[PDB]
């Protein structure tokens, strides 16, 4: 290795005066720039368009945080041309050179962390720590993938020798692909899905989520300053079902890296399986979708520890996480003790403008507000509302921490991803039934168990069918490198982000033999 061993970027807690001062300064700089317009980034240059995308402040939707260009089919085609032209030479860069480029990007991002964090606060309503964790994760993806990519360098395949011959197998990148990202982790996931494929030689056309186009543009300002060759990375903010679908169905798109809703992921995976007219390969599509994550608590657990972890997992970033605890499964002996503690903690949570660092900011948009409120109405007919369940005052999309109890395992609110601050509590007889209820959903992303009984924990290790399982701690915030992230079943294709295996997904192998 030529760099220090990987370490996770510390997540700022803002406990010091200097950290708070630095954040206030960043917040001011960011809002003073609310009038900025960010063009598309294609072939190494910023290119503007006639139409535009508008980004609002979810804590004050009448306030615009910025606008960006809007990519249509023509811009998608221009991006494709630039990406394939660039691939021709980018694929030949020594891996050491590509990895150093990522390391430079990581250093530049680290120097602009407060700015990016402040942008997350205003654009998608993350409180201070949720924003810092997001940016820190993005830096982690760059640092981790830069190092991981070297593990695949020419010629990396272990083969069996043969007399009188040289047998050499090695990996090569696939080509130009499209990255379609979500709005909930607009810096971290957006960055990771882009730099992983790019690190090993692929080129990318990135389509940020409509609600986070501004922060996505700032990430590209970093890529531009880092010096990625023209066409290696392209920025195409636009409408998902328009430019996103166009690229997904295109015969010249080699792979698709998607993170988002199951509904969209299903369409993308299906489209990826079709041979478009003139297409000359089998497309690879990686789709990480939602989850309906549960935390199980039995009668042997530390109830206070459990209540704390549950509240953090269910309401962090207003529950807008694919890893959020949306189900709380309690065995009979743990039901009362835990529910009472969860209710007491949850009722003390503050909700308000994200910039004031409340426990909960607003949900991301009017559309999300509509969906969450709709599920709350459905919940009133399936379970018992015991806390919250109301829109709070203000133009911002403030929704109160909500709790439904005595919820049937098969209830819609106990099966469908609400993606809001809504927790469904389910009462079960014992641990075995708790596991049965935990597994009985179409998903399998994250899960947790609070218990002191070793046999229950190890039992869950083997049978709680989720890609990321946590014992006696929160089930959100998977750290790059430490906890490969990705689920089972309808939670996705199990493309483990922040892990060595992730990069293999964007490579193909060639075996060359020479008989002397």
Active site residues: 288
Which of 207, 341 has the CB closer to ligand NAD? 207
Name the binder of 55 from a copy of itself, ligand NAD, Na ion, none, CB < 5-8 A by kind: Na ion
Among 45, 166, 367, 395, binds a copy of itself (CB under 8 A): 166
> Which SS3 state, helix, strand or coil, does residue 227 take?
coil
Q: Which residue has the tokens 């835990």?
A: 338
DSSP output for 331-383: EHHHHHHHHHHHHHHHTT--BS-GGG--SB---S-HHHHHHHHHHHHHHTTTS
Q: List binders of a copy of itself among 56-95 (CB under 8 A).
A: 94
**Interface with Na ion, residue 211, by CB under 5 A:** yes
**Interface with a copy of itself, residue 116, by CB under 8 A:** no
Q: How far apart are CA 243 and CA 88, in angstroms?
A: 24
Q: List binders of Na ion among 9-68 (CB under 5 A).
A: 55-56
Sheet containing 176-180: give its strands across: 45-47, 40-42, 233-235, 203-207, 176-180, 255-259, 284-288
With a CB cutoff of 8 Å and minimum separation 6, the contacts of 199 are: 98, 99, 102, 145, 146, 148, 149, 503
Q: How far apart are CB 8 and ligand NAD at their closest, in Å?
A: 18
Please give the backbone phi and psi of residue 352, each rounded to the nearest 5 degrees, phi first.
Answer: 180, -165
Whether 91 and 201 have beta carbons less than 8 Å apart is answered as yes
**Interface with Na ion, residue 313, by CB under 5 A:** no
Name the binder of 235 from ligand NAD, Na ion, a copy of itself, none, CB < 5-8 A by kind: none
Name the binder of 381 from ligand NAD, Na ion, a copy of itself, none, CB < 5-8 A by kind: none
**Interface with Na ion, residue 123, by CB under 5 A:** yes
Please give the backbone phi and psi of residue 214, each rounded to the nearest 5 degrees, phi first.
Answer: -65, -50
Total number of residues that touch Na ion (CB under 5 A): 4
Residue numbers belonging to the annotated binding site for L-glutamate: 184, 322-323, 477-478
Q: What is the DSSP letter of 412?
A: G
**Interface with a copy of itself, residue 49, by CB under 8 A:** no
Among 274, 380, 410, 429, binds a copy of itself (CB under 8 A): 274
Cβ neighbours of 93 (radius 10 Å): 15
Q: List binders of a copy of itself among 208-237 (CB under 8 A).
A: 225, 227-229
Among 15, 282, 377, 393, binds a copy of itself (CB under 8 A): 282
Whether 226 and 160 have beta carbons less than 8 Å apart is answered as no
Q: Which residue has the tokens 């696939």?
A: 174
Which of 56, 198 has the CB closer to Na ion? 56
Which of 207, 327 has the CB closer to ligand NAD? 207
Q: What angle do CA 325, 327, 333 make, to 5 degrees?
A: 115
Name the binder of 185 from Na ion, a copy of itself, ligand NAD, none, CB < 5-8 A by kind: ligand NAD
Name the binder of 484 from ligand NAD, Na ion, a copy of itself, none, CB < 5-8 A by kind: a copy of itself
Q: How far apart are CA 155 and CA 292, in angstroms?
A: 42
Tokens describing residue 235: 């920025």
Containing 20, the helix (H) or strand (E) segment is helix 17-32
Query: What are the CA-CA distances from residue 138 to residues 27, 70, 193 (Å)?
Result: 20, 24, 10
Q: List binders of a copy of itself among 478-497 (CB under 8 A).
A: 478-486, 488-490, 492-494, 496
Q: Which residues lie near ligand NAD (CB under 6 A)?
A: 180-185, 189, 207, 209-210, 240-241, 244-245, 248, 259-261, 264, 267-268, 288-290, 322, 417, 419, 445, 491-492
Residue numbers belonging to the annotated binding site: 181, 183-184, 207, 210, 240, 261, 289, 322-323, 417, 477-478
Which of 366, 482 has the CB closer to a copy of itself? 482
Name the binder of 69 from a copy of itself, ligand NAD, Na ion, none, CB < 5-8 A by kind: none
> Which SS3 state, helix, strand or coil, does residue 182 take?
coil
Q: List binders of a copy of itself among 433-462 (CB under 8 A).
A: 442, 452-455, 457-458, 461
Q: Which residues bind Na ion (CB under 5 A)?
A: 55-56, 123, 211
């Amino acid at each position: 290795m030529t760099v220090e061993p990987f370490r996770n970027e510390p997540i700022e807690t803002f406990q010091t005066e200097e950290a708070r001062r630095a954040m206030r300064e960043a917040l001011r700089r960011v809002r003073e720039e609310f009038g900025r317009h960010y063009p598309l980034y294609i072939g190494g240059e910023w290119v503007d368009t006639k139409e535009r995308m508008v980004s609002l402040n979810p804590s004050a939707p009448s306030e615009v945080v910025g606008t960006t260009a809007k990519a249509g089919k023509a811009e998608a085609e221009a991006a494709l041309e630039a990406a394939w032209k660039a691939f021709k030479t980018w694929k030949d860069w020594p891996q050491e050179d590509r990895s150093r480029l990522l390391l430079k990007a990581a250093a530049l991002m680290r120097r602009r962390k407060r700015e990016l964090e402040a942008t997350l606060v205003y654009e998608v309503g993350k409180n201070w720590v949720e924003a810092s964790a997001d940016v820190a994760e993005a830096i982690d993806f760059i640092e981790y993938y830069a190092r991981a990519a070297l593990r695949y360098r020419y010629p990396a395949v272990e083969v069996v020798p043969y007399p009188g011959e040289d047998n050499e197998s090695f990996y090569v990148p696939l080509g130009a692909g499209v990255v379609i990202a979500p709005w909930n982790f607009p810096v971290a996931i957006f960055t990771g899905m882009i730099v992983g494929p790019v690190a090993v030689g692929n080129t990318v056309i990135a389509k940020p989520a409509e609600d986070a186009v501004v922060v996505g543009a700032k990430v590209f300002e970093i890529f531009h300053e880092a010096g990625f060759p023209p066409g290696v990375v392209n920025f195409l903010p636009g409408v998902g079902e328009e430019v996103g679908a166009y690229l997904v169905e295109h015969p010249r798109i080699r792979f698709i890296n998607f993170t988002g809703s199951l509904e969209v992921g299903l369409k993308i995976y299906e489209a990826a399986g079709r041979l478009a007219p003139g297409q000359t390969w089998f497309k690879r599509a990686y789709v990480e979708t939602g989850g309906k994550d549960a935390i199980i608590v039995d009668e042997t657990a530390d109830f206070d520890l459990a209540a704390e972890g549950v509240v953090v997992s269910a309401y962090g970033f207003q529950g807008q996480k694919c890893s959020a605890a949306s189900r709380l499964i309690l065995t009979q002996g743990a039901y009362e003790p835990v529910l009472e503690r969860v209710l007491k903690r949850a009722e003390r949570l503050s909700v308000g403008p994200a910039e004031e660092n409340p426990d909960l900011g607003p949900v991301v948009s009017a559309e999300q507000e509509r969906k969450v409120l709709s599920y709350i109405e459905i919940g009133k007919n399936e379970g018992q509302l015991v806390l919250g369940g109301k829109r709070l005052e203000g133009e911002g999309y403030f929704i109160a921490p909500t709790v439904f109890t005595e919820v049937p395992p098969k209830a819609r609110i106990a099966q469908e991803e609400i993606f809001g601050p809504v927790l469904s509590v389910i009462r079960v007889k014992d641990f075995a039934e708790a596991l049965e209820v935990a597994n009985d959903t179409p998903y399998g992303l994250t899960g947790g168990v609070y218990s002191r009984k070793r046999e229950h924990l190890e039992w869950a290790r083997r049978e709680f069918h989720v890609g990321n399982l946590y014992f006696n701690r929160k089930i959100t915030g998977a750290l790059v490198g430490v906890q490969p992230f990705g689920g089972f079943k309808l939670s996705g294709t199990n493309a483990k982000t922040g892990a060595l295996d992730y990069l293999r997904l964007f490579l193909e192998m060639k075996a060359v033999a020479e008989r002397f």
